[PDB]
Ligand binder design. Structure first.
Ligand code: NA
Lengths: 186, 76
């Protein structure tokens, strides 16, 4: 109960220190390119895309979700925590160039992430033992100039959602994990 | 029905732009078959609103069209 409150306070301090620092909001994401294939009905889409100038905003709203889940075994306190941005949204903006057949346009994209959540684990004999950005519950993609009824939108939005669940989540983990490690293990 | 008419007019214009863009990726006949299947699904959805069979690979379109129609109807 007291250990739970101390861990809550330490987590809140880590969050505040990371947010008071730059690089977290807006957060740069390295450029990413990919080939892709999808099948939409009878249409067989094969093409390539590139995402540049990728920026994530909204992580200044990171907030501990509920008490630290604390359990003590063999004189070591273990705690798992969730930190998220559930009331607000984390938005990714980027320039998208894609090639499909004779189409090679560049457009601007806004991708909204719902329920951005980080799972974290601590051990107190504080050492951080686990840190991950959980899979996104939903990614809403707005691709400039494309109708939501366009099959090209369907393909591009599906490929982009997969890229967010893979590359983007890995890059955000790369940035966030050492920041939290530094703040908590001090 | 002027409201239904404005919806169908805007929808046909969106479909025309989609058809033009698809003709830059696929052959003419494939695009025509795809547009025909799409219009069939649109018809079924609109008639049901006035369980819908959905061809494989078009489930995304069914969800997106529900979102599009609800958006335009709340706008109208
Ligand atoms: Na970038």
């Amino acid at each position: 109960d007291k250990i739970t409150e101390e861990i809550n306070k330490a987590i809140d301090d880590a969050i505040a220190a990371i947010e008071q620092s730059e690089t977290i909001d807006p957060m740069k994401v390295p450029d990413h390119a990919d080939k892709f294939e999808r099948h939409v009905g009878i249409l067989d889409f094969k093409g390539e895309l590139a995402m540049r100038n990728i920026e994530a905003r909204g992580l200044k709203q990171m907030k501990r979700q509920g008490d630290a889940n604390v359990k003590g075994e063999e004189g070591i306190v273990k705690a798992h925590l969730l930190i998220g941005v559930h009331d607000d949204i984390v938005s990714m903006e980027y320039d998208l160039a894609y090639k499909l057949g004779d189409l090679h346009p560049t457009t601007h994209v806004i991708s909204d992430i719902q329920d951005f959540v980080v799972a974290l684990s601590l051990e107190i004999p504080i050492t951080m033992t686990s840190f991950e950005v959980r899979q996104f519950a939903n990614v809403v993609n707005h691709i400039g100039g494309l109708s939501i009824l366009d099959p090209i939108f369907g393909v591009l939005s599906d490929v982009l959602t997969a890229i967010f669940q893979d590359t983007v989540r890995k890059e955000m983990t790369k940035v966030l994990a050492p920041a939290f490690k530094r703040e908590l293990e001090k | 029905s002027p409201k239904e008419e404005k919806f169908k007019k805007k929808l046909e214009e969106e479909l025309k732009k989609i058809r033009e863009r698809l003709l830059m990726v696929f052959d003419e006949e494939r695009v025509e078959e795809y547009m025909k299947i799409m219009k069939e699904v649109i018809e079924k959805i609109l008639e049901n609103r006035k369980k819908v069979e959905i061809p494989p690979g078009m489930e995304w379109f069914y969800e997106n069209f529900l979102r599009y129609y609800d958006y335009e109807e709340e706008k109208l």
